[PDB]
Amino acid sequence: GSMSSSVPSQKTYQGSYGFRLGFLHSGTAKSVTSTYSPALNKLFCQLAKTCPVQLWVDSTPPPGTRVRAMAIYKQSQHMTEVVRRCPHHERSSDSDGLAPPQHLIRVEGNLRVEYLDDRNTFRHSVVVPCEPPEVGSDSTTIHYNYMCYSSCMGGMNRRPILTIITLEDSSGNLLGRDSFEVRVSASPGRDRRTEEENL
């Protein structure tokens, strides 16, 4: 589809503030809508359901810090192809009004969400202000939504993707980076259990 002339770095970088991702320990029951496999570093989730991702730091980042999410294809031969929604779902107009219909990754429950189509790389990303934990809480959670199945033909087309989360300062400079593989399917609990059986 759309071809980029670069590939974003995937290098894990904790940085000065000790940035890393956390996930709920949800298990693999049929009722789960998302579940994270530490052994695979892979999130399994359902189409358009909340995926809570925790942002952990050892120190408070400076004011105006933001958190960006971006998807890339995992396999080398696909990495320069921009990850985007399939034609069916793009023309489906199931947007909450804020998200571009071509974007795979949305953030829910945040009215300060900002979406970027990069003018040079053509990649899509979604960025929100990074907030410290709420009173009583230990971490900051962001609720992501994946708006296509991994099997959507004409979009991901059964190709595995990586989601890259970056902490950036107000000017856009990199403060930290982490990532995880994603599979979007109708049965994440079963898919995780099955893929873990095959290690």
Ligand SMILES: *C[C@@H](C)C(=O)n1cc(C=O)c2c(-c3ccc(N4CCN(C)CC4)cc3)cccc21
């Ligand atoms: C923008 C976002 C990354 C942020 O500002 N942020 C995230 C977190 C935590 O996830 C933040 C804290 C924070 C960090 C750690 C703790 N705990 C207390 C006890 N636990 C077990 C270990 C450390 C609490 C709060 C603070 C400020 C920002 C922040």
Ligand SMILES: [Mg+2]
């Ligand atoms: Mg990790």
Ligand SMILES: [Mg+2]
């Ligand atoms: Mg090729």
Ligand SMILES: [Zn+2]
């Ligand atoms: Zn789709």
